[PDB]
Amino acid sequence: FVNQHLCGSHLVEALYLVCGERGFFYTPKT
Amino acid sequence: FVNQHLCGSHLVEALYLVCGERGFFYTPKT
Amino acid sequence: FVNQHLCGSHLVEALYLVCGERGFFYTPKT
Amino acid sequence: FVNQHLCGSHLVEALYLVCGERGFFYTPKT
Amino acid sequence: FVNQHLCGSHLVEALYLVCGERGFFYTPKT
Amino acid sequence: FVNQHLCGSHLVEALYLVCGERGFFYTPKT
Amino acid sequence: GIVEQCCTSICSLYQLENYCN
Amino acid sequence: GIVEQCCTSICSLYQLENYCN
Amino acid sequence: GIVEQCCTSICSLYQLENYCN
Amino acid sequence: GIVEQCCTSICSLYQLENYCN
Amino acid sequence: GIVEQCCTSICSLYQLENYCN
Amino acid sequence: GIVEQCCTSICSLYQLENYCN
Ligand SMILES: [Cl-]
Ligand SMILES: [Cl-]
Ligand SMILES: [Zn+2]
Ligand SMILES: [Zn+2]
Asked: What's the CA gap between E15 and E24, in Å, rounded?
């Protein structure tokens, strides 16, 4: 895999792909 | 607003748009 | 809900989620 | 180009890519 | 069709829509 | 990581996220 | 409408342009 | 869970807010 | 307009809702 | 091909890497 | 190339079509 | 954190994997 530059919803999409059925938590600063 | 089927990456995109900075958890296993 | 920063197609996705079966119109400047 | 099924947010994303600055209407009720 | 400003995955989505069942190749620099 | 169904634009988005700068081919006909 | 043309059935990018303003 | 509420069944944006932190 | 506002500044879902049919 | 591996069946991110250049 | 052109400048769907298989 | 890191810098899928449940 390659390093990623992910903003906004793109990060969430990436988390979705990486975590699959495990799901994930999305915790931005502030 | 509306009620509609939100699945998969679309579901997490919707969470990302509703929750934003609050963050969210996506836990399909429950 | 939280305020949104939406460019490009992200805005259209948001309109899609917000409007559901009502649909929407996308009317950029110029 | 091609013909293919475009549904849901993908449909509006496609409209956003075909119409762009012209804008568009997405009116699923007809 | 209108001209496009497409970065990141948005370009890939556009290629997907334009090429349909033909598929496509995504070849960034470096 | 996980195994999951990746179809359509989601498949190419996933390729775009796994391959990135390497680029990729999406060749549904095989 | 657009859903019938493009989602239920299939449409081209040109047909999609029918829904531009 | 969220999948049952929003994907299998349908949910509102408000219901989606149930899954915010 | 809304397309510009959301991108150069911010906008709310409530603002967006005004653009539904 | 990729569609059979990853859409019709399921694939891992590693298998997806098979389609990188 | 096209990936850069579309992002740093603009590109057309017709240009993109050149990248189909 | 990861949300900022991925956007202002870069991040890896391996880093992301830490955010799975
Ligand atoms: Cl973006
Ligand atoms: Cl889908
Ligand atoms: Zn989808
Ligand atoms: Zn984007």
From this structure: 7
Work out the angle at residue B25's Cα, subtended by the Cα atoms of residues B13 and A10, and round it to the nearest 5 degrees. 35
Q: Please, which chains are in contact with I (at least 3 CB pairs closer than 8 A)?
A: B, C, D
Ordered DSSP codes for E1-30:
---B---THHHHHHHHHHHGGG-EEE----
CA distance D9 to F13: 15
Give the method used: X-ray
Tokens found for residue E26: 């995504």
Cβ contact (<8 Å) for F17 and A21?
A: no
Q: How many domains does chain F have?
A: 1
- Ligand 1 centre to CA of A7 (Å) is 7
Q: Any residues with CB less than 8 A from the CB of L9 and at least 6 apart, and which?
A: A5
Give the integer Cα–Cα distance in Å for L19 and A14: 11
The distance from CA F23 to its chain's CA centroid, rounded to whole angstroms, is 10
Between chains, do B2 and C14 touch, taking CB under 8 Å as contact?
no
Domain coverage including residue D4: 1-30
Nearest CA in chain B to C4: B17
The CA distance from A10 to E20, in Å, is 23
Tell me the structure's resolution in angstroms, rounded to a single decimal: 1.5
